[PDB]
Design a protein around this ligand. Structure first.
Ligand SMILES: [Zn+2]
Length: 226
């Protein structure tokens, strides 16, 4: 039913829309939907929306570039060697989509959580941050998360102002007489640990001195960057 009425509708999509969709459907980090020549993905973890309009050429793509979608707008075209940003929209050869959507996924980083009351129960609310600026920076340097660097969360200690990696935070707060488990909310700064530079950068590409981190984080960084 919602199988044939599914196979029939799908089969009637334009070849182009099918081709583009076939580039993205394996990226299960996103929930996908198709409507006409528009492919919409919803990042499963963060709920970030990605709208992909399929166009026949650059003129069309450029015309669609001007579009608010309350999320990431991408215009996919069959033209090769095309990759630029116009009016905030990505305009790219559809063969760059898979790599682009994956880079986008790598840039939607968990930054904290908050526990909220809800219908008599406590519910955890996660905070995600789409690092678009860093995304563009990494694409230009052909930098790949997990390969040339990784994003990692550090907590800004309300006691010494030093940055401590999330894992050593428990022990760190303990030494201050503060119990981590009694906290019902926390926010972290997301830093980049660059394997190439053997240095730490903020989410904007700016380098961060090592003295900004607690003695614990310091060695952790040293450990990771090796
Ligand atoms: Zn501290």
């Amino acid at each position: 039913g919602l199988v044939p009425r599914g196979s029939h509708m799908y089969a009637e999509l334009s070849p182009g829309t099918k081709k583009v969709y076939t580039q993205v459907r394996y990226l299960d980090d996103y929930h996908w939907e198709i409507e006409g020549s528009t492919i919409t993905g919803i990042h499963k973890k963060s709920n970030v929306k990605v709208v992909i309009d399929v166009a026949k050429n650059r003129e069309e793509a450029d015309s669609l570039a001007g579009k608010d979608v309350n999320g990431i707008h991408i215009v996919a075209i069959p033209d090769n060697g095309v990759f630029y940003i116009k009016n905030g929209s990505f305009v790219l050869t559809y063969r760059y989509l898979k790599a682009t959507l994956a880079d986008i996924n790598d840039h939607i980083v968990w930054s904290g959580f908050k526990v909220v009351e809800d219908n008599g129960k406590l519910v955890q609310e996660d905070v995600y941050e789409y690092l678009g600026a860093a995304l563009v920076n990494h694409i230009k340097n052909n930098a790949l998360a997990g390969q040339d660097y990784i994003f990692w969360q550090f907590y800004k200690c309300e006691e010494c102002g030093k940055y401590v990696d999330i894992e050593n935070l428990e022990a760190h707060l303990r030494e201050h007489g503060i119990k981590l488990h009694e906290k019902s909310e926390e926010h972290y700064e997301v830093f980049e640990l660059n394997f190439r530079e053997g240095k730490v950068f903020d989410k904007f590409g700016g380098e961060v001195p090592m003295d900004k981190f607690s003695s614990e984080a310091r060695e952790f960084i040293k450990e990771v960057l090796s």
